[PDB]
Amino acid sequence: HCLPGHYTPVELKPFLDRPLQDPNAPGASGKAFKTINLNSEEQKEKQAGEEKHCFNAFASDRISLHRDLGPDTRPPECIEQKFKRCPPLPTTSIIIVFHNEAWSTLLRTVHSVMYTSPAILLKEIILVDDASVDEYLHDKLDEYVKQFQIVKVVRQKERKGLITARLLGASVATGETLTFLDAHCECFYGWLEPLLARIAENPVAVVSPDIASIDLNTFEFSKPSPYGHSHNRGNFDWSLSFGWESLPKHENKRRKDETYPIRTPTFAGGLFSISKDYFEYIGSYDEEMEIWGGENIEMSFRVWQCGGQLEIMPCSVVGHVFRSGTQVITRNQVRLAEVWMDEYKEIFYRRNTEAAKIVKQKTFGDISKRIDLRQRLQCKNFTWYLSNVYPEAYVPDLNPLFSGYLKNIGNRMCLDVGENNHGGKPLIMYSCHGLGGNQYFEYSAHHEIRHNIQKELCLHASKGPVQLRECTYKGQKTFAVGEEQWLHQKDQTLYNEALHMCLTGNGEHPSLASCNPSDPFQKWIFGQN
């Protein structure tokens, strides 16, 4: 079953030929649809759509389910890439989980897949209904989908979330590989072959496309650039949030051109392909995780520690409509920390008070099956992960000198880094929540007040609003500069030695003021959670 040479373009022709498109139609070729100066009914429809789907459904509903994305703008080595017939390209089962998805967005996803995926690879499209209410997602969907012959709806009767839905999808799939997509995606030209070719070469590779943005207001598709605009890897922070970071120099050097995988410490986890056999062998998903949140970080750690490769294939591009309770997500994160993170789980627990509580109350469930998996696969430990996969990571102290919150006596609020503070921004005063996160601060042996969830940031004294800056102390040669050294004095003042001034919690932004221990706005409690 193993033929010589490379697949021909005709061998890889798609499952369905895209009908000719109207270049001046709304959102043609992936262009912006500006929905502006609407009649009175029209503004009510758009507003309704926005509240139901958290994207401009008014726009989606006026854009073709068949829209092309214009010329192929990938790097030339992606466009010219040829694939060996031995080992053969494996078949794939597409698995899409949906819950109350717009019709326009779900069926544009399914049409996109059929117009872009080689017929010889596309075994089936499995749509897993996670207990949708919308009636059009019941019999109308079932009947509409029959014409495509390979599309099947699987009904999860009660809402159990993405994890359970994906495992149900995988249990009925007959493809050699599984390809997970969300229900609001558009495939670019050539997206599937690079994922399936990489699994063919390396059966322990878990491979993700480069995920392009579809704009939630205009549905503009951010097209790839032919230079390959400097790529991102996935990471995590010590709140166990998924994030994106630049490639290190060593990875830029290894990748001779864009057909080379990007090795990624973590994956976003919405869009990826895996050998169906490897998905089973590596322990699928932790069945005791509820709804969703954390499963992509858990699977990242498990794949790396248990001997697989987590890769982004930049020749593979899929667009996704990016958008924008806590107990379920925190419990999922505690279960992954308890199984994979060894002694480093305490770094996470100190930053997420709800997680520390779930651990102390032992409400995270039995993990014996995931511990047995880790033992049976002889997985490496989290020290090995950090040394070998993510040697660039900032790793906080396992046992920091001190951590907690900084509560102001004057206004009874907490010092707070605010949203999206990666340095260079002032701080705010915010209601004390006791949750850690944006109110988490550590005290160091060098008298620094660190906020160290993603970057190592230091409270940095200035004439204006105090700021967070990247700490100057980071190893043996370096020093903590005066602006980043603080004394918590017997009068409860936070004193900067360099500027001879005290932090005040008055005004919009905490600032330095002449030291006045009578001023309750200058009195701070460095409390423990």
Partner: peptide, 12 residues
């Protein structure tokens, strides 16, 4: 009062 940021994946 805000949660520990997540709910939808962020883009690059």
């Amino acid at each position: 009062n805000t949660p520990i940021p997540r709910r939808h994946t962020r883009s690059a």
